Amino acid sequence: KQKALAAALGQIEKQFGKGSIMRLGEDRSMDVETISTGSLSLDIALGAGGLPMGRIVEIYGPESSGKTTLTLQVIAAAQREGKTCAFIDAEHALDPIYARKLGVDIDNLLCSQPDTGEQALEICDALARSGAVDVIVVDSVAALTPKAEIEGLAARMMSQAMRKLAGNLKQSNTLLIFINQTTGGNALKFYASVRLDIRRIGAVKEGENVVGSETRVKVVKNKIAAPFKQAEFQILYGEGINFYGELVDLGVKEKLIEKAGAWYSYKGEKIGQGKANATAWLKDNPETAKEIEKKVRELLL
Amino acid sequence: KQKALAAALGQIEKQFGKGSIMRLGEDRSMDVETISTGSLSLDIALGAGGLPMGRIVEIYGPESSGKTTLTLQVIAAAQREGKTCAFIDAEHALDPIYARKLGVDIDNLLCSQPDTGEQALEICDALARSGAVDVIVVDSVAALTPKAEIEGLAARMMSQAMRKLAGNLKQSNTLLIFINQTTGGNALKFYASVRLDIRRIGAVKEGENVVGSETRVKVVKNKIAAPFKQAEFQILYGEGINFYGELVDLGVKEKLIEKAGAWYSYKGEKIGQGKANATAWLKDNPETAKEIEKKVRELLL
Amino acid sequence: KQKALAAALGQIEKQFGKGSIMRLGEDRSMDVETISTGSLSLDIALGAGGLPMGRIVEIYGPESSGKTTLTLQVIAAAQREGKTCAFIDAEHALDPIYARKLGVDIDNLLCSQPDTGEQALEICDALARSGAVDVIVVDSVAALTPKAEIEGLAARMMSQAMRKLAGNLKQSNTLLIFINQTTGGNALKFYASVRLDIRRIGAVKEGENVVGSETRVKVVKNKIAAPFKQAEFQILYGEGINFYGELVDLGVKEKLIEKAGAWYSYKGEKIGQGKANATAWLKDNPETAKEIEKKVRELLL
Amino acid sequence: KQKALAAALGQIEKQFGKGSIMRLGEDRSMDVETISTGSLSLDIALGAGGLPMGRIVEIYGPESSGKTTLTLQVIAAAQREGKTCAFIDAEHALDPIYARKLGVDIDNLLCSQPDTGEQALEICDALARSGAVDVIVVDSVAALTPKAEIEGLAARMMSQAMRKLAGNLKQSNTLLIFINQTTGGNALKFYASVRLDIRRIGAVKEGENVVGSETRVKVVKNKIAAPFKQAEFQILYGEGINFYGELVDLGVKEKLIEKAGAWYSYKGEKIGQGKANATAWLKDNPETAKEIEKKVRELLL
Amino acid sequence: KQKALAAALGQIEKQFGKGSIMRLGEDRSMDVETISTGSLSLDIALGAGGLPMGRIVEIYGPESSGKTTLTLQVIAAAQREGKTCAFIDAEHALDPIYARKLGVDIDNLLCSQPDTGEQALEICDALARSGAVDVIVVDSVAALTPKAEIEGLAARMMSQAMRKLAGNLKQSNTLLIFINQTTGGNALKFYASVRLDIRRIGAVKEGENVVGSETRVKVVKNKIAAPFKQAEFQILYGEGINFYGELVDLGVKEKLIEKAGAWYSYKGEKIGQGKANATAWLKDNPETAKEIEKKVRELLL
Amino acid sequence: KQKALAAALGQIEKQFGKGSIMRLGEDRSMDVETISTGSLSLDIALGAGGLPMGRIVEIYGPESSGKTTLTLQVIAAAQREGKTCAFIDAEHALDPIYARKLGVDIDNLLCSQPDTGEQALEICDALARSGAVDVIVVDSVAALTPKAEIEGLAARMMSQAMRKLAGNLKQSNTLLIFINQTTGGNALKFYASVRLDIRRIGAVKEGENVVGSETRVKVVKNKIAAPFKQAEFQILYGEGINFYGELVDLGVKEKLIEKAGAWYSYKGEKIGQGKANATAWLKDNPETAKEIEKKVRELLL
């Protein structure tokens, strides 16, 4: 049994690939380079600590769900490591000011505003084949209007280009993210290695005023590690993902940070009173947080 | 007549198998291992007290009909007995939190999110041949997009794989459930030993608020026992199937529980006033209910 | 002429059988045992007062035409006389609750849900040869999927089995009814002794609400008596065919029931005011209606 | 890398055209004749110093956003250079008095008030093919009612005519501007070389009274130079765009004008105390401002 | 250029009709019979000296704007020339006393107070086809309640009848005026040859008391001559449009009347001191004013 | 012309009914039975000499306008001829004492004080269908509160019942009057054959004291004769309409009564000195006035 189980299981893996079947409880992630999403709770949920390079990723949610902020944060993290990013825009909504406050190197962000949906996919493929771009972001699947319509179709346009793109993105190790509201048929649903469902579940108030959104992200599909885990974090208006806020919570769960009622302490010293202050501290001590985060990752990844 | 009747009848049985013809009134169920559906009224309707191992089962209903809750409950019951379960997902909708509140051992639930419809069927076949999995659940037939379409077909894909799967599932005694909305042609309709039609018929209110769904399940096909019997039960949000609620009703019908207007009693003592309280009691006295349930089964199965 | 006419006519009859030619106006029905259809107006249209035993009958109409209700009513009438009935199901749609409200002895109804179309036909043949079943009902011709398709064909499958079935059904005096939507080719069209075309022509309203269907049935083929006569009756939801309603109308046409504007009388006494009340009465006086019906039959059959 | 980057990048350009991809930070504008928008801060944001001739431009914003003032200013600038302008009106709102105070040569402004939306597009095409008009302005997309509606449709009407118009406007080097509130589908969104988003963000007060609007314009689409840059300027009631006001601010940013607390100086002499006075001066010394503006352009374009 | 300009321009005209495009500065009016509006400054603004016969005209403004007075004045002028007028009333507000003081021949004014909006439009069409009525006035578009509403719709009702009406009004050379507050959709907006926007901009005081309204009329649409010109005049309570008052002002602008500070003179003699007296004079010398007016028209039309 | 005019005109009449168009100057009234309003000047303005039977009439004016007095006077005149009257009250304001001083037969006045607005309309319809009531008066439209509101709506309630009421009131020749302040939408505005606008324009003083109201009534809608004529008369407190006062004035206008400065004479003899005395006389000589009135009517009607 337990012998023939892990046995056949392996059979399915060589016969169908890595991750063709998994115990939802397993921790075994694959050997894949990963770009952070900007959320520590999400990087964890993902299993590999971030989004897999060379794969197609889908991020979808309603309006004001925070799906753009997410995609921007990954661009920031990517660029923050020397990775060249390209933004394929069909929405014409990018807010460079907000992007900058998030760490995006707007000046070096490659941008394309294609004439049709087919053109966008084609420009994506070309970039994929250049082996010169590390991450591509398509904003968004719903805006990718087929040439015919500009002058059913959408599903065929996506299908018509998904196999080639995937192969090319794989061969050059390029990460590609499609932002969606799902439109485009099943091509994207099945070729994607990761599919994220993001939505606003509440508000973040600074007393009487609203300063952010209480966000939830579910990894509904994951071919790199176990799927169905979720992540909750805050997106503060004009600032982005409350990372350090997560670091506090997760630093206390994994018992790396001590909480004495309202006081948080790390290895001998106090860092602050209240989540509000603990966060303030960590954000105030870069090299320390990088250490706490690293332990949290080693522990949970 | 009555002699030549039961005579020819038997002839049809050896010539065509067990259950090729049945008096809808008969009680003769076959010698088959069965996994509970989580509904006592359904286990009864099924005749064999549950779903038959080694057979293909189809469960279908509209959106929000409770077909997933049902399939989850059987996984729970299965795992709750040491059976290894696999969830072949093509919907990417599994809610692990809700599953857990239902008793599913998420950690040990095997999960596969195949690249195509053909791949899913193939992974099912492999698992069927491993003789290492006890129950497989495919979610769902409509999402099993054929490779060709990803790049008529659906009906051929199902047919193309149904005979082999059935043989393999039979030889290893593996139970396989297809969740459907019917799509896939006739292959599934004819190979399935049990076909369940589930739908939401009303709401369950806790006064002014809605806390669940009034559900009805019809066994439209049954090759293990007489078909066409139905079952009615409640699915409480965040909790699952109101089993003990059924146990009360069925415990009173079969006269195992005495009802004095609003008071329910079992063998000398009172257990509660009102269906609400009787249920509360039974759910509060595990070993007692297991006894009442056992009598109800011996009586009705 | 008139001499040589009836002369040659007879010649065609001995040379080709009974009913190979008929004056549409004739009344001469054959010596055949007949099961009621549940409609008095239909039993009449049929000429022999019902469906002929030992023959193949086809009943066809669109969805919601009332073709199932019809077939159920004949099963009821059959069982209501000690006849053993078998329901060969390939639709998996039987509603036992509604069947019961119609008089069907569900408990004693034999039921078979075959693996293929060929199997169903074969099970029919076997039952036909048992000489133990009086009436068989196949639901339905369109659902009788050929094995090949499950893994042109339909027409061959029907043809391949029609001659044998007919001979066997004849030798054992078994009545067989195929429900259709025509599918299956010409085999059924030519072997059937009776072909009924049924359809919903209007609604039956109880004031502001709809409580039934205004039905029409045309005997498009009849090898037992003159063909092309039609029947109109009501099918009341949850109740079946408004028989007594027919009995009133037909009781007045044949002048067995007197109508005084809005008052109906039978042999000296009044039975009710309005069709609604007359019906209520007759349904309220079983042995009286049986008498009126008997006169109506003797008169019109 | 950096070699293969600029390499593939070029590939995308020849394969897809000029500006199919751009580093948002780049300054490389194309070889295109450009008409001023009347805003120095906007001409800059545009990259090419103004709107591109021979292309379709879209300007959109809410009511009272200043989108008309903008379109009028470009007509003024155009005519102020011998360019022939045509105003395709479907709003019937043009204010000739205000237009004149802005520099529009009303007398020579060609005007058409078409019978339908299709007619307007057709008149546009004809003018485009005449090679006799330099700039066309359509007021507005939302008012372009389809003939059918006058007696879904709108999107088809726009699509039905966009390819032809674009080709014709290109061949004759005619600039065409659509004013919108977006209506008309995707045809305009994808064929447009420039899409401007304009809106009123605040008021301009002369103490206690409101004399103008604080305006913001975002270049959400730009196929002639990098997109996403924005421009802020004032629209003074009855006067138009506070150009010289911009010239002051931008003259100080680029260090061409010295600011000593409240005193502004240009090459040795003082021009005024306070933004209010500096502006007054520049507007008072035409040939001087033309020089400062020219330096600002050479520096920022 | 200037050659190919006037060239293509002509092309647009034959291809689309007369006035499909115009230099707002042009003076070329069409060959159309015209009824005076009662305002000399308006007749001029109109270009053709009045409202075009055989066309649909729209006059709209708020309550108390003077739109009725205007429509009444044209009826007066029309009747004052033998033209037969019809007043289609749905407001039930006509003031015959005031109309008379304006010159309307109430006794000969045809009047209809239709049962529905559709009926009114139909009565208009019939009158249009009679070729017996010269001018029709509909009071008012907003009161034209659709039959359905009496028992979206309004826009369809107008559209449903506009093409036919226009053709019929054209063929019989009938002038039709719709008074509006815009309601009725785009049908009227596009079929109308002239659209007038009228509103009260101030009061007219006879010292301490208010005796009239300072009115402004903008020709927002004109398919007979250049559009967008405006007219200002006074409407004196109980008297109507201060025509002669206009004649004075316009007689001085075109230098046909000499003004010596406060004295007005015409060809050698003095006519009065002050606008008040000059007007008094002209109104006192009919045949003289008719001459001055004629020169003013020849000069400005 | 004059031929084709009266021609088409007739066409509109047969096509749309009697009075679908009229020369405001015409005198041609229809063949309709009419009840006096109590005002001779109003009966005249109406054209048919009174209110049309079988039609819906609306009377509206502010508070204290005299609209009730008017409606009471018609009831008096009606009853004074054997006509049965019904007063549908929703105001609960009827003053029986004042009504009596006006000639109303309170004792025989039918009265209904309905539970809702719908009920009132329904009671009106029933009375209309009885063919037993000659005149119905609804007091008042504004008080007809819709059932829903008692527990937009008003307009629908009126519309919902206006067509039926009109047909029924027509078939039984019943006159129905709605008193209004307009409320109820357009249903009443368009179905009414006559709409009266009544208001108090001044006081009637008996020296130093005020004894009545100077009233004006405008027939703003009239489908029985030319509309827009008005009537002026006095309503004396506690007495009603100063009829004979009108008879004097109108008797002098039509030259049936001679006025010698302050003396009034009729056919040879003097009747009084001063309007005050002439009236006193006529009111003092019933059969004489009836004669003068009859001549006045023959002359002016």
From Swiss-Prot, chains A, B, C, D, E, F:
UniProt-annotated location(s): Cytoplasm
- In the UniProt record for this chain, what is stated about the effect of gene disruption? Triple mazE-mazF-recA mutant cells no longer undergo an apoptotic-like death upon DNA damage characterized by membrane depolarization.
Predominantly, its location class is: cytoplasm
GO cellular component terms, alphabetically, are: cytoplasm; DNA polymerase V complex
Q: What does the UniProt record note about how this protein's activity is regulated?
A: The rate of DNA-strand exchange is stimulated by RadA.
Q: What is the effect of changing D249A?
A: 10-fold increased survival following 3000 Gy ionizing radiation
Q: Name one GO molecular function term.
A: ATP hydrolysis activity
Query: Which Pfam families did the record assign?
Result: RecA (PF00154), RecA_C (PF21096)
Please give a single GO biological process term from the UniProt record: translesion synthesis
> Keyword DNA damage, does the record have it?
yes
Task: Provide this UniProt record's keywords sorted from A to Z.
Answer: ATP-binding, Cytoplasm, DNA damage, DNA recombination, DNA repair, DNA-binding, Nucleotide-binding, SOS response, Stress response
Checking CDD domains in the record gives: RecA
- NADP as a keyword? no
Induction remark: Induced by DNA damage, repressed by LexA. Induced in response to low temperature. Sensitive to temperature through changes in the linking number of the DNA. Induced by cold shock (42 to 15 degrees Celsius) (at protein level). 5.1-fold induced by hydroxyurea treatment (at protein level). mRNA levels are repressed in a mazE-mazF-mediated manner.
Residues bound to ATP are G61, P62, E63, S64, S65, G66, K67, T68
Its biological purpose:
Required for homologous recombination and the bypass of mutagenic DNA lesions by the SOS response. Catalyzes ATP-driven homologous pairing and strand exchange of DNA molecules necessary for DNA recombinational repair. Catalyzes the hydrolysis of ATP in the presence of single-stranded DNA, the ATP-dependent uptake of single-stranded DNA by duplex DNA, and the ATP-dependent hybridization of homologous single-stranded DNAs.
Family label: Belongs to the RecA family.
According to the record's subunit comment, the protein's assembly and interactions are: Polymerizes non-specifically on ssDNA to form filaments; filament formation requires ATP or ATP-gamma-S. Interacts with and activates LexA leading to autocatalytic cleavage of LexA, which derepresses the SOS regulon and activates DNA repair. Interacts with the C-terminus of RecB, facilitating loading of RecA onto ssDNA at chi sites. Interaction is decreased by ATP.
- What protein am I looking at? Protein RecA
- Source organism: Escherichia coli (strain K12)
Gene this chain is encoded by: recA
